[PDB]
Here is the input.
Amino acid sequence: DMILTEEMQKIMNLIQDDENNVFVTGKAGSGKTTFLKYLIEKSGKNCIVAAPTGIAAINAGGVTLHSLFGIPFGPITPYDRLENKFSEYKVELLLKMELLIIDEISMVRPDILDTIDRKLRWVYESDEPFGGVQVIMFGDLFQLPPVTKKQEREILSDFYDGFFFFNALVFKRTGFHIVELTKIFRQTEPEFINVLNNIRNYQVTSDELDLLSELKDRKISSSYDNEYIHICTHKADVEKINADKLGEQEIRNYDIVIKDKFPESSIPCDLHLKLRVGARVMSLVNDSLKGYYNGMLGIVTALEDNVITVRMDNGRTIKFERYTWSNTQYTLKDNEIVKEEIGSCTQFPLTLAWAITIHKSQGLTFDKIIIHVSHTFCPGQLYVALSRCRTLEGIVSDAFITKQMIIPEYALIDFERAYKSEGNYYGKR
Here is the structure.
């Protein structure tokens, strides 16, 4: 499958030198997911992939940071006492890890990175950052920030100049290169790219504000029988829409199947998938052979015990069977890091898709979207919502988009401009 770009090769060139840490970033559709898999195989190193959330871990074929390093969920200051209780086997593992890959890095709080630094220095009995382990970080820099609890904000604000990963104190003692994957190759047409970038950076023109007001359409935005997906801020709103459209007649239910050990928060699919013929659905996974991708939309045309038949918007009928997600953990075999499965969950990789939250839609793109506007958007939120459509022409809004909704996240903007202006590098050296 995978197209190797000059940017990807630049990352692989950088990684040759054990002393180079790297941040791999880029928008949805720029090949981060596939390139992550590639990088692991071609690294020639004992690699562990970790992520801040269970779903991200599952999908990257790795483990949560919390599981791996025994880190609690809540905020830890650099001087707080650390539970340094690793099993013997965990110590052996971490001492063989040459390369740590952290996926979804923008969802990693800076204290977490500092706790990882501290624990690895403890394990390696070393003063070098991260115990001398090479670190690669992956993620869309402009993925929507995790919601900060006011107590977290209280705790961490004393030490950190911001609530992003790059604010970690360890970056006073080490640093990293940045390479942005900028291909995507089909998100492409000039007016739209410029609009999105200007929204991201809070420099929209009057003409662009006019462009945005033209997205309002009461008729389309109030219909649930077009091929438009409704993009909402809140989970409850989405649940109400999907439930109302589903109805209560001729509903089939399919329960998730759990085998052995599976964390609650790693479950990436519906627990109880309720469907009817005619239901609007989205694929949750990529399958080359059957020909569907994550985010692909369609209509349920049959419901059987072991097969759900769907007519995709591209007109093709696909037989969906249950998919198995494996919960793996890393171990050692003959001096190498390998994975072993310790549990799994099995479910049809489909979910109702009349509506989707802005959060669950991250990393996806659609042909036709309805943005449900809010007067309480967060920084970056409008940007992320609009970037869920492949074209400007495919977007409608339920109310007029105004400059009030165009809220920049300057911490992120300024970070990008910082590393770009300093040789695509951030931190010490």
About this structure: The CA atoms of residues 93 and 331 lie 6 Å apart. The domain at 6-185+411-427 is CATH 3.40.50.300 (Rossmann fold). The radius of gyration is 22 Å.
